[PDB]
């Protein structure tokens, strides 16, 4: 029909007028929300603004998907079990240049846009660095015009929010979907069945998977905009529904329950966690193939499809793809295996052979009987390749097998990912080398070409323009706007290091962010802060190996020197530690209680004054990282060498005018390599010194004997200086540090404190200090997720990035 | 603030503008639906259109609510378990005058508005007459300017969709909510807790209800528009959610997730605990919403500013729940709380027989609602004092009037609770309201006459004429104009045109066009030839023994036997249509449906019959189908055994739409025949007084089987296996019932029924006379407008006045 051409996107968005944005706002508040100004809550005004912004999103979104259907590009699929999105309101505005228009429009309507900004809940879809990585990657992928989809699960309750009561961590429900979420769209049209349990019948055709229990997977779509390029991509999240039925008995009420809670909560080996993995994998694959068929010819599949496996969590995508291709599409085993390998690639984030995912076979046999078969067949054929390549070597067969013999039979999912992917990558340079050298050496020796590095990276949008507009603003002045999408050219700033106007500017922006963050702290927890002090922050997930305990040791040392001679001048410091502990982890809960207790002693001690403060930062998450990171002077990256694969907080601090004190570990190695060892506070044992120390054996008592400061704090700790109501409250923190300290806190102590004195020394000197910050920021370019993604694109997926601004919308 | 004035509805898509509707349609497909013309489905285009009509509706909704917050009128609350809403799209467009403009809008966007309308699901909210009555009233109360709210449950899967397989009823789930409901609005911010179980602590200051289980009641708002007056009222429906717990004890809390949630999953229909939970749930969440709204102070101004209509006994707990909130939570003394209650509430009774009335055993009430039981016992004891006062000595009357009834198990008679906690008890038909005073409730009447009343049911002329029969509305509005739509009595003027050739042929023409549309719809599913010239003989009600579709079946087979006996006789061709759902687990009704289709398998494929006779069973009968088959009918079958029907609302639809009525003297039939004139009506069979006489002397089915050789042949056919050749004795329990335990006297009304049908056959043979009679029915039918009914509610019951005045916006 010729008349149907009038059903169009063209006349719709019009433009971004202050008159238009006001119009749509009143329209969304009244027609979409069914409120008016007499009953509107700040939440309702937030929602109205979100909807007014979404309209500009969806317009660019329809056009992008139309573009992809026209152009049939290679489709890239990023599978993650977490997506640490944070907030969307401000990110959408900067990416669509709606920034000032909305600001003005909100002002004319008589509301503070910022008030509305703070009402938005952090997306309850992610947990740690892994989830943040995927969020940065999605932003980069859209910004470089790749046809990319993020696939995962829509958790209703995320992972808890953290309250601190009397120094103790408590966990509450993150009910972030309470009032709904303006950003997502339900797609009941595309609901897909997912199967579980049942049994396999080996009949004439091939294998049939019958008598299964069905869970429905309904998708919700979220737009992911690029940086002012008008390309909008999709995040498709699966939500679980049980089918509706009518039988003499309703014992199958559990059905409904254990079907629903696949989409209820993140973790943490529950049978549940495996159901989550299968669920996301099964729906996503049916969806991919469906989209492939709407161009049957599976030879071109690897030319039109790329599937990334973020860790082993989505590892069942390999047997699943094999299952569909062989059982359903009637393809023969060899041809389908070829398609699978060339389609899939695997990213490892782990440095120890302990974190790596294994599942008992009795589990797989019960819920995924067909997949267990395919896994066995994959194993026998792979072990053939091995036996031909290394005839004789029996030990190799067993070391490389997907099946693992022990007290209990297990499938090693990392060995599955490696056998079924064309590329495997580590996430930082030293990390990828350890993978080759130790963790996966047998596979590397079989297939050297398969193993790559792709150093991690951060998005300059959220982590520079969004969170630090002041700093983005003073840079643009010297070099232009282009760096935002090409971070490599912050290098230009290396000319302005002896320029005086820039030094005072870079120093002014920092102090200002320190002021604004000092204010936000007061206006919530009643906690006095000298905004002139060095801002010492360690924001990480609380673990023994992350070594916030080494931080504590330095803090108490510093406090002791203030008590010994209250008259020696000392560089003032606010020490801020934040991060969630895993429920269960008894040691992490104790570390928090300790930090809060130190604070209680030092922050109320009259002699100390304002020269030293210790604050735990409650409920650390993206939107809070956005606040503290631009406010920091000193970035604590103090993990034992060897324990970090990369890190990411890493790069955020460096991009934001903070100097680093850290170990030669993870991506610090590469950061120090960009800034120059001299523009970095590197200290403590190296990866080689650790290996040396486990060889001759680590006795923590022979550091304890030679250092009277360490001896003193241990005493204060044991006698109950920090818990006068419960002296023995910290006994098992001491026990560990002394007897089973697997992470060598006492070792690195000597050098850590010296290094801290060099820090304090340099900070006495504002100009020199700022000149060092500059040399860090300038040289922060390699760590853009734009660079990371360009490498994934050319080196693994086989697609070319493009920064061409798509036409649209009202064209 | 003055900056804050710019947040207003004023200039937001204001018009009937083919232009702006085309602008908005596009907005919604792309921005609300995230679809486009490449990807879009017929369903998609319908949602875009639904959304376009919605923008204009909510504008008037915002305004009607703003307006209600200063004028502060006496609010009326209609509590109903069912709301039989049907489809919403065109009832909405006709009421705002957007129809013509949307038609044009969609037409120039390369789309056909008729298709789009067929995509919409019937709201899964109601079951039969009681639900539809609630829905007609909501349309009426908005049309007469009243400040009304509908309160009910939002059933996720409603009550089953009906599918016929092998001539057997089967039930499928109705997820009418699968793609969402564009008409409603989630209100998560107004969630209320609802309490179950627990126990009662008597403290010095007052009683406490502690240690309870809690279920959350989430309201959904649906707007209900007035006819062209711009008053848009509210239907608020509660949806049950379980609280989110996040451990040791045990996860039997998983049961109280599910038990919690199927309060809201499905309608009904053992005497379930679940039913009772459903009744308290809607009552409790509703009474909190009322009080709440009444504070955005003392309760002296409560029977004057609030009105609670109980529709049947289902929301009866409102009386004892109101007393709970006022004494326990609000600290009024029992007398001041009682006075507010007995004046706040009014009860509508829909039943004819004493064992149709709701009765909960106490052991059940003691577990689930302990505080309510104490209040009931307290309510009862006082009420009994008044009876012993006003009737000394009479220890024979106390037990008869007690709320506490002493059966095998001890039970609480929920009707007596209703008569005691309300000032007005209303009947639903003039004869019905009288048998309440006469026998069923005499004791209560001989104690409070002033209480009891009649408010004959009505039906909205919007859905049931203008919307379903635009052909008939047109020809009428050509003579007398359009004012009748909101004043159905003006149809009286059509008595003048009874002898007008043009008008006569006009009426016959619409009826004939309605039959052609319907025959086409039919010929599609049920792939059978419909003869559009045959008399359309239709019976649509619940499938029940007393409703008597078995009487109709016997006529059909009589007719059949005659054609096979004398195939060269002229016979007026008939299309016989029977439709209605059978309660699952009511076995006899499942057999009746099987009998109707089995008669169909023979008669519709007998080559000797040709197209003189056809029997169709109308599958999945529901509001939207009702509005297709009603305009197409010639004959309305209203044949319940006399005395069994309080009213009968579908009767009035057929009457309004050009059908003639064959019916016993019962329910709404009486006031129909009285209004139309008796000889304009096909009355047959026993009257109420005639039935008594058969119960006086006994009913024996053999002395009808004996005197009537045609009745005989039919029974021999059923028993012999005529209509069930593969399974000869499939209908044995039907024969047995007819022979030995026919509680409803099918045989007794037979002769008189078939005689009367010949008189229908004879009149249909004279098209001019048939139509003049049809005219006489239509013209005489305004008394059954639910605009009338509602007015007698507002005046004689609620104490508000109807207004036909417009409201502006913006």
PDB file of C-alpha atoms in Angstrom, chain B residues 448-675:
ATOM      1  CA  UNK B 448     -38.786  -2.809  58.472  1.00  0.00           C
ATOM      2  CA  UNK B 449     -41.086  -2.188  55.466  1.00  0.00           C
ATOM      3  CA  UNK B 450     -39.447   1.199  54.692  1.00  0.00           C
ATOM      4  CA  UNK B 451     -36.260  -0.824  54.098  1.00  0.00           C
ATOM      5  CA  UNK B 452     -37.400  -2.978  51.181  1.00  0.00           C
ATOM      6  CA  UNK B 453     -37.732  -1.746  47.579  1.00  0.00           C
ATOM      7  CA  UNK B 454     -37.632  -2.527  43.855  1.00  0.00           C
ATOM      8  CA  UNK B 455     -35.295  -1.198  41.207  1.00  0.00           C
ATOM      9  CA  UNK B 456     -36.052  -3.049  37.955  1.00  0.00           C
ATOM     10  CA  UNK B 457     -32.907  -3.795  35.966  1.00  0.00           C
ATOM     11  CA  UNK B 458     -31.938  -1.823  32.886  1.00  0.00           C
ATOM     12  CA  UNK B 459     -29.374  -2.001  30.124  1.00  0.00           C
ATOM     13  CA  UNK B 460     -27.353   0.779  28.542  1.00  0.00           C
ATOM     14  CA  UNK B 461     -28.681   2.045  25.190  1.00  0.00           C
ATOM     15  CA  UNK B 462     -25.066   2.903  24.237  1.00  0.00           C
ATOM     16  CA  UNK B 463     -23.452  -0.516  24.004  1.00  0.00           C
ATOM     17  CA  UNK B 464     -26.784  -2.213  23.325  1.00  0.00           C
ATOM     18  CA  UNK B 465     -28.177  -0.054  20.530  1.00  0.00           C
ATOM     19  CA  UNK B 466     -25.949   2.728  19.185  1.00  0.00           C
ATOM     20  CA  UNK B 467     -22.801   0.607  19.337  1.00  0.00           C
ATOM     21  CA  UNK B 468     -24.034  -2.869  18.253  1.00  0.00           C
ATOM     22  CA  UNK B 469     -26.843  -1.748  15.880  1.00  0.00           C
ATOM     23  CA  UNK B 470     -25.795   1.476  14.064  1.00  0.00           C
ATOM     24  CA  UNK B 471     -28.252   0.601  11.270  1.00  0.00           C
ATOM     25  CA  UNK B 472     -31.169   0.648  13.738  1.00  0.00           C
ATOM     26  CA  UNK B 473     -29.988   3.806  15.547  1.00  0.00           C
ATOM     27  CA  UNK B 474     -29.794   5.609  12.210  1.00  0.00           C
ATOM     28  CA  UNK B 475     -33.326   4.937  10.990  1.00  0.00           C
ATOM     29  CA  UNK B 476     -34.685   5.903  14.412  1.00  0.00           C
ATOM     30  CA  UNK B 477     -32.583   9.130  14.525  1.00  0.00           C
ATOM     31  CA  UNK B 478     -33.914   9.946  11.037  1.00  0.00           C
ATOM     32  CA  UNK B 479     -37.415  10.209  12.442  1.00  0.00           C
ATOM     33  CA  UNK B 480     -37.072  11.398  16.028  1.00  0.00           C
ATOM     34  CA  UNK B 481     -33.479  12.738  16.175  1.00  0.00           C
ATOM     35  CA  UNK B 482     -30.675  11.680  18.545  1.00  0.00           C
ATOM     36  CA  UNK B 483     -31.918  12.677  22.034  1.00  0.00           C
ATOM     37  CA  UNK B 484     -33.383   9.204  22.707  1.00  0.00           C
ATOM     38  CA  UNK B 485     -29.840   7.798  23.186  1.00  0.00           C
ATOM     39  CA  UNK B 486     -29.559   9.566  26.540  1.00  0.00           C
ATOM     40  CA  UNK B 487     -33.332   9.403  27.282  1.00  0.00           C
ATOM     41  CA  UNK B 488     -34.666   6.080  25.916  1.00  0.00           C
ATOM     42  CA  UNK B 489     -38.319   6.949  26.682  1.00  0.00           C
ATOM     43  CA  UNK B 490     -38.558   9.076  23.500  1.00  0.00           C
ATOM     44  CA  UNK B 491     -38.803   5.799  21.570  1.00  0.00           C
ATOM     45  CA  UNK B 492     -42.486   6.068  22.525  1.00  0.00           C
ATOM     46  CA  UNK B 493     -42.808   8.392  19.506  1.00  0.00           C
ATOM     47  CA  UNK B 494     -42.271   5.415  17.173  1.00  0.00           C
ATOM     48  CA  UNK B 495     -45.868   4.297  17.833  1.00  0.00           C
ATOM     49  CA  UNK B 496     -46.816   6.964  15.270  1.00  0.00           C
ATOM     50  CA  UNK B 497     -44.789   5.340  12.494  1.00  0.00           C
ATOM     51  CA  UNK B 498     -46.341   1.876  12.980  1.00  0.00           C
ATOM     52  CA  UNK B 499     -48.327   2.452   9.741  1.00  0.00           C
ATOM     53  CA  UNK B 500     -45.573   4.126   7.729  1.00  0.00           C
ATOM     54  CA  UNK B 501     -44.499   1.996   4.737  1.00  0.00           C
ATOM     55  CA  UNK B 502     -41.070   3.606   4.542  1.00  0.00           C
ATOM     56  CA  UNK B 503     -40.299   3.104   8.237  1.00  0.00           C
ATOM     57  CA  UNK B 504     -41.700  -0.446   8.172  1.00  0.00           C
ATOM     58  CA  UNK B 505     -39.493  -1.408   5.210  1.00  0.00           C
ATOM     59  CA  UNK B 506     -36.575   0.464   6.785  1.00  0.00           C
ATOM     60  CA  UNK B 507     -36.796  -1.630   9.993  1.00  0.00           C
ATOM     61  CA  UNK B 508     -37.032  -4.904   7.997  1.00  0.00           C
ATOM     62  CA  UNK B 509     -34.050  -3.766   5.887  1.00  0.00           C
ATOM     63  CA  UNK B 510     -31.669  -3.234   8.852  1.00  0.00           C
ATOM     64  CA  UNK B 511     -32.694  -6.556  10.421  1.00  0.00           C
ATOM     65  CA  UNK B 512     -32.016  -8.241   7.097  1.00  0.00           C
ATOM     66  CA  UNK B 513     -28.631  -6.492   6.809  1.00  0.00           C
ATOM     67  CA  UNK B 514     -27.755  -7.524  10.365  1.00  0.00           C
ATOM     68  CA  UNK B 515     -28.544 -11.131   9.446  1.00  0.00           C
ATOM     69  CA  UNK B 516     -26.294 -10.950   6.370  1.00  0.00           C
ATOM     70  CA  UNK B 517     -23.300  -9.675   8.391  1.00  0.00           C
ATOM     71  CA  UNK B 518     -23.917 -12.408  10.971  1.00  0.00           C
ATOM     72  CA  UNK B 519     -24.498 -15.239   8.452  1.00  0.00           C
ATOM     73  CA  UNK B 520     -21.143 -14.319   6.903  1.00  0.00           C
ATOM     74  CA  UNK B 521     -19.335 -14.297  10.282  1.00  0.00           C
ATOM     75  CA  UNK B 522     -20.996 -17.653  10.917  1.00  0.00           C
ATOM     76  CA  UNK B 523     -20.251 -19.376   7.554  1.00  0.00           C
ATOM     77  CA  UNK B 524     -16.556 -18.747   8.315  1.00  0.00           C
ATOM     78  CA  UNK B 525     -16.042 -20.740  11.591  1.00  0.00           C
ATOM     79  CA  UNK B 526     -18.739 -23.462  11.792  1.00  0.00           C
ATOM     80  CA  UNK B 527     -18.282 -24.094   8.105  1.00  0.00           C
ATOM     81  CA  UNK B 528     -22.016 -24.570   7.383  1.00  0.00           C
ATOM     82  CA  UNK B 529     -24.475 -22.942   4.967  1.00  0.00           C
ATOM     83  CA  UNK B 530     -26.607 -20.363   6.743  1.00  0.00           C
ATOM     84  CA  UNK B 531     -29.802 -19.412   4.934  1.00  0.00           C
ATOM     85  CA  UNK B 532     -30.016 -15.658   5.635  1.00  0.00           C
ATOM     86  CA  UNK B 533     -33.771 -15.777   4.863  1.00  0.00           C
ATOM     87  CA  UNK B 534     -34.622 -18.211   7.658  1.00  0.00           C
ATOM     88  CA  UNK B 535     -36.041 -17.052  10.992  1.00  0.00           C
ATOM     89  CA  UNK B 536     -33.111 -16.442  13.384  1.00  0.00           C
ATOM     90  CA  UNK B 537     -34.129 -18.346  16.521  1.00  0.00           C
ATOM     91  CA  UNK B 538     -31.706 -17.602  19.340  1.00  0.00           C
ATOM     92  CA  UNK B 539     -31.293 -18.661  22.974  1.00  0.00           C
ATOM     93  CA  UNK B 540     -28.285 -17.281  24.865  1.00  0.00           C
ATOM     94  CA  UNK B 541     -27.883 -17.797  28.579  1.00  0.00           C
ATOM     95  CA  UNK B 542     -26.079 -19.866  31.169  1.00  0.00           C
ATOM     96  CA  UNK B 543     -26.456 -23.591  30.407  1.00  0.00           C
ATOM     97  CA  UNK B 544     -28.617 -24.810  33.295  1.00  0.00           C
ATOM     98  CA  UNK B 545     -31.529 -27.208  33.813  1.00  0.00           C
ATOM     99  CA  UNK B 546     -33.932 -24.437  34.869  1.00  0.00           C
ATOM    100  CA  UNK B 547     -32.878 -22.163  32.036  1.00  0.00           C
ATOM    101  CA  UNK B 548     -34.385 -24.988  30.001  1.00  0.00           C
ATOM    102  CA  UNK B 549     -32.420 -25.300  26.793  1.00  0.00           C
ATOM    103  CA  UNK B 550     -33.700 -28.907  26.807  1.00  0.00           C
ATOM    104  CA  UNK B 551     -37.182 -27.533  26.085  1.00  0.00           C
ATOM    105  CA  UNK B 552     -35.766 -25.804  23.000  1.00  0.00           C
ATOM    106  CA  UNK B 553     -33.989 -29.034  21.979  1.00  0.00           C
ATOM    107  CA  UNK B 554     -37.321 -30.875  21.971  1.00  0.00           C
ATOM    108  CA  UNK B 555     -38.998 -28.300  19.746  1.00  0.00           C
ATOM    109  CA  UNK B 556     -36.027 -28.525  17.345  1.00  0.00           C
ATOM    110  CA  UNK B 557     -36.348 -32.339  17.075  1.00  0.00           C
ATOM    111  CA  UNK B 558     -40.145 -32.057  16.719  1.00  0.00           C
ATOM    112  CA  UNK B 559     -39.613 -29.689  13.796  1.00  0.00           C
ATOM    113  CA  UNK B 560     -37.053 -32.112  12.379  1.00  0.00           C
ATOM    114  CA  UNK B 561     -39.395 -35.114  12.692  1.00  0.00           C
ATOM    115  CA  UNK B 562     -42.104 -33.239  10.784  1.00  0.00           C
ATOM    116  CA  UNK B 563     -39.869 -32.370   7.835  1.00  0.00           C
ATOM    117  CA  UNK B 564     -38.740 -35.988   7.503  1.00  0.00           C
ATOM    118  CA  UNK B 565     -42.402 -37.109   7.774  1.00  0.00           C
ATOM    119  CA  UNK B 566     -43.779 -34.658   5.214  1.00  0.00           C
ATOM    120  CA  UNK B 567     -40.842 -33.323   3.164  1.00  0.00           C
ATOM    121  CA  UNK B 568     -43.153 -31.589   0.658  1.00  0.00           C
ATOM    122  CA  UNK B 569     -44.938 -29.481   3.311  1.00  0.00           C
ATOM    123  CA  UNK B 570     -44.190 -25.754   3.266  1.00  0.00           C
ATOM    124  CA  UNK B 571     -42.270 -24.989   6.430  1.00  0.00           C
ATOM    125  CA  UNK B 572     -40.822 -21.654   7.514  1.00  0.00           C
ATOM    126  CA  UNK B 573     -37.047 -22.234   7.540  1.00  0.00           C
ATOM    127  CA  UNK B 574     -35.304 -21.609  10.864  1.00  0.00           C
ATOM    128  CA  UNK B 575     -31.747 -21.166  12.002  1.00  0.00           C
ATOM    129  CA  UNK B 576     -31.708 -22.372  15.624  1.00  0.00           C
ATOM    130  CA  UNK B 577     -28.858 -20.898  17.692  1.00  0.00           C
ATOM    131  CA  UNK B 578     -28.106 -21.839  21.298  1.00  0.00           C
ATOM    132  CA  UNK B 579     -25.115 -20.438  23.168  1.00  0.00           C
ATOM    133  CA  UNK B 580     -23.785 -20.222  26.728  1.00  0.00           C
ATOM    134  CA  UNK B 581     -21.110 -21.616  29.003  1.00  0.00           C
ATOM    135  CA  UNK B 582     -21.505 -24.536  31.368  1.00  0.00           C
ATOM    136  CA  UNK B 583     -19.981 -24.376  34.850  1.00  0.00           C
ATOM    137  CA  UNK B 584     -17.042 -26.788  34.873  1.00  0.00           C
ATOM    138  CA  UNK B 585     -17.962 -29.846  36.976  1.00  0.00           C
ATOM    139  CA  UNK B 586     -21.715 -29.386  36.414  1.00  0.00           C
ATOM    140  CA  UNK B 587     -22.084 -32.628  34.497  1.00  0.00           C
ATOM    141  CA  UNK B 588     -25.667 -32.250  33.343  1.00  0.00           C
ATOM    142  CA  UNK B 589     -24.868 -28.951  31.597  1.00  0.00           C
ATOM    143  CA  UNK B 590     -21.902 -30.626  29.767  1.00  0.00           C
ATOM    144  CA  UNK B 591     -24.374 -33.243  28.519  1.00  0.00           C
ATOM    145  CA  UNK B 592     -26.872 -30.608  27.345  1.00  0.00           C
ATOM    146  CA  UNK B 593     -24.125 -28.966  25.208  1.00  0.00           C
ATOM    147  CA  UNK B 594     -23.269 -32.400  23.797  1.00  0.00           C
ATOM    148  CA  UNK B 595     -26.960 -32.953  22.977  1.00  0.00           C
ATOM    149  CA  UNK B 596     -27.228 -29.604  21.115  1.00  0.00           C
ATOM    150  CA  UNK B 597     -24.207 -30.345  18.861  1.00  0.00           C
ATOM    151  CA  UNK B 598     -25.281 -33.959  18.329  1.00  0.00           C
ATOM    152  CA  UNK B 599     -28.685 -32.759  17.103  1.00  0.00           C
ATOM    153  CA  UNK B 600     -26.632 -30.451  14.854  1.00  0.00           C
ATOM    154  CA  UNK B 601     -24.574 -33.310  13.329  1.00  0.00           C
ATOM    155  CA  UNK B 602     -27.688 -35.052  12.103  1.00  0.00           C
ATOM    156  CA  UNK B 603     -29.993 -32.169  11.084  1.00  0.00           C
ATOM    157  CA  UNK B 604     -27.295 -30.035   9.374  1.00  0.00           C
ATOM    158  CA  UNK B 605     -26.200 -32.944   7.143  1.00  0.00           C
ATOM    159  CA  UNK B 606     -29.548 -34.607   6.469  1.00  0.00           C
ATOM    160  CA  UNK B 607     -30.066 -34.203   2.666  1.00  0.00           C
ATOM    161  CA  UNK B 608     -33.892 -34.343   3.014  1.00  0.00           C
ATOM    162  CA  UNK B 609     -33.847 -31.265   5.327  1.00  0.00           C
ATOM    163  CA  UNK B 610     -32.079 -29.065   2.699  1.00  0.00           C
ATOM    164  CA  UNK B 611     -31.740 -25.650   4.255  1.00  0.00           C
ATOM    165  CA  UNK B 612     -35.090 -25.538   6.027  1.00  0.00           C
ATOM    166  CA  UNK B 613     -33.476 -26.225   9.404  1.00  0.00           C
ATOM    167  CA  UNK B 614     -30.046 -25.631  10.982  1.00  0.00           C
ATOM    168  CA  UNK B 615     -28.808 -25.998  14.562  1.00  0.00           C
ATOM    169  CA  UNK B 616     -25.696 -24.088  15.569  1.00  0.00           C
ATOM    170  CA  UNK B 617     -24.175 -24.078  19.003  1.00  0.00           C
ATOM    171  CA  UNK B 618     -22.606 -20.657  19.571  1.00  0.00           C
ATOM    172  CA  UNK B 619     -19.125 -21.177  20.888  1.00  0.00           C
ATOM    173  CA  UNK B 620     -17.535 -19.026  23.649  1.00  0.00           C
ATOM    174  CA  UNK B 621     -20.537 -16.774  24.301  1.00  0.00           C
ATOM    175  CA  UNK B 622     -19.401 -13.438  25.703  1.00  0.00           C
ATOM    176  CA  UNK B 623     -20.110  -9.693  25.471  1.00  0.00           C
ATOM    177  CA  UNK B 624     -18.514  -9.077  22.069  1.00  0.00           C
ATOM    178  CA  UNK B 625     -20.376 -12.022  20.519  1.00  0.00           C
ATOM    179  CA  UNK B 626     -23.613 -10.968  22.230  1.00  0.00           C
ATOM    180  CA  UNK B 627     -23.291  -7.687  20.368  1.00  0.00           C
ATOM    181  CA  UNK B 628     -23.111  -9.523  17.020  1.00  0.00           C
ATOM    182  CA  UNK B 629     -25.915 -12.098  17.482  1.00  0.00           C
ATOM    183  CA  UNK B 630     -28.463  -9.845  19.277  1.00  0.00           C
ATOM    184  CA  UNK B 631     -28.908  -7.350  16.366  1.00  0.00           C
ATOM    185  CA  UNK B 632     -29.378 -10.357  13.996  1.00  0.00           C
ATOM    186  CA  UNK B 633     -32.135 -12.192  15.938  1.00  0.00           C
ATOM    187  CA  UNK B 634     -35.808 -12.539  15.018  1.00  0.00           C
ATOM    188  CA  UNK B 635     -36.830 -14.612  18.055  1.00  0.00           C
ATOM    189  CA  UNK B 636     -35.553 -14.343  21.642  1.00  0.00           C
ATOM    190  CA  UNK B 637     -35.966 -17.571  23.687  1.00  0.00           C
ATOM    191  CA  UNK B 638     -36.767 -16.648  27.293  1.00  0.00           C
ATOM    192  CA  UNK B 639     -38.119 -19.932  28.532  1.00  0.00           C
ATOM    193  CA  UNK B 640     -37.088 -20.536  32.156  1.00  0.00           C
ATOM    194  CA  UNK B 641     -39.651 -22.428  34.262  1.00  0.00           C
ATOM    195  CA  UNK B 642     -41.900 -19.673  35.689  1.00  0.00           C
ATOM    196  CA  UNK B 643     -40.820 -18.404  39.109  1.00  0.00           C
ATOM    197  CA  UNK B 644     -37.110 -19.167  38.680  1.00  0.00           C
ATOM    198  CA  UNK B 645     -35.903 -15.793  37.310  1.00  0.00           C
ATOM    199  CA  UNK B 646     -35.489 -12.642  39.355  1.00  0.00           C
ATOM    200  CA  UNK B 647     -35.009 -10.533  36.205  1.00  0.00           C
ATOM    201  CA  UNK B 648     -33.269 -11.350  32.948  1.00  0.00           C
ATOM    202  CA  UNK B 649     -31.227  -8.567  31.404  1.00  0.00           C
ATOM    203  CA  UNK B 650     -30.565 -10.166  27.939  1.00  0.00           C
ATOM    204  CA  UNK B 651     -34.341 -10.165  27.366  1.00  0.00           C
ATOM    205  CA  UNK B 652     -34.219  -6.383  27.200  1.00  0.00           C
ATOM    206  CA  UNK B 653     -31.351  -6.424  24.662  1.00  0.00           C
ATOM    207  CA  UNK B 654     -33.313  -8.506  22.177  1.00  0.00           C
ATOM    208  CA  UNK B 655     -36.345  -6.342  22.696  1.00  0.00           C
ATOM    209  CA  UNK B 656     -34.375  -3.130  21.984  1.00  0.00           C
ATOM    210  CA  UNK B 657     -32.897  -4.692  18.782  1.00  0.00           C
ATOM    211  CA  UNK B 658     -35.842  -5.890  16.717  1.00  0.00           C
ATOM    212  CA  UNK B 659     -36.440  -9.383  18.091  1.00  0.00           C
ATOM    213  CA  UNK B 660     -39.761 -10.796  19.214  1.00  0.00           C
ATOM    214  CA  UNK B 661     -39.863 -12.766  22.495  1.00  0.00           C
ATOM    215  CA  UNK B 662     -41.134 -16.260  23.183  1.00  0.00           C
ATOM    216  CA  UNK B 663     -41.155 -16.589  26.970  1.00  0.00           C
ATOM    217  CA  UNK B 664     -42.833 -17.761  30.147  1.00  0.00           C
ATOM    218  CA  UNK B 665     -44.453 -15.220  32.453  1.00  0.00           C
ATOM    219  CA  UNK B 666     -41.356 -14.515  34.607  1.00  0.00           C
ATOM    220  CA  UNK B 667     -38.703 -11.995  35.675  1.00  0.00           C
ATOM    221  CA  UNK B 668     -38.324  -9.133  33.230  1.00  0.00           C
ATOM    222  CA  UNK B 669     -40.771 -10.810  30.828  1.00  0.00           C
ATOM    223  CA  UNK B 670     -43.745  -9.489  32.905  1.00  0.00           C
ATOM    224  CA  UNK B 671     -42.696  -5.832  32.763  1.00  0.00           C
ATOM    225  CA  UNK B 672     -41.817  -6.292  29.101  1.00  0.00           C
ATOM    226  CA  UNK B 673     -45.201  -7.777  28.129  1.00  0.00           C
ATOM    227  CA  UNK B 674     -46.935  -5.284  30.374  1.00  0.00           C
ATOM    228  CA  UNK B 675     -45.077  -2.467  28.656  1.00  0.00           C
TER     229      UNK B 675
END
